[PDB]
Amino acid sequence: LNSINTNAGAMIALQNLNGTNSELTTVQQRINTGKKIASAKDNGAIWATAKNQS
């Protein structure tokens, strides 16, 4: 398929790049905060237990 309107390989490459970007942002947060569970979004139950313990 030598189409000029659709480029599926670019779509797949963009999906992979977006996944890499998300992983990099997660590691950036985990470094600058020093916490693997810095908010309710990271893990709700363990974050709740930590808030109660603190």
Partner 1 sequence: GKLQDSLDAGVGNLVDADLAKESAKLQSLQTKQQLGVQALSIANQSSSSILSLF
Q: What residue ranges bind partner 1 (CB under 8 A)? A: 1-8, 10-11, 14-15, 17
* Shortest distance, position 13 Cβ to partner 1, whole Å: 9
Query: Residues touching a second copy: how many (CB under 8 A)?
Result: 10
47 close to 39: Cβ distance less than 8 angstroms: yes
Which helix (H) or strand (E) is 3 found in, with range?
Answer: none
37 close to 50: Cβ distance less than 8 angstroms: yes
**Four-residue CA torsion sign, 27, 32, 36, 42:** negative
Residues in 9-48 at the binding interface with a second copy, rule: CB under 8 A:
9, 12-13, 16-17, 25, 28-29, 32-33
Interface with a second copy by CB under 8 A: which residues? 9, 12-13, 16-17, 25, 28-29, 32-33
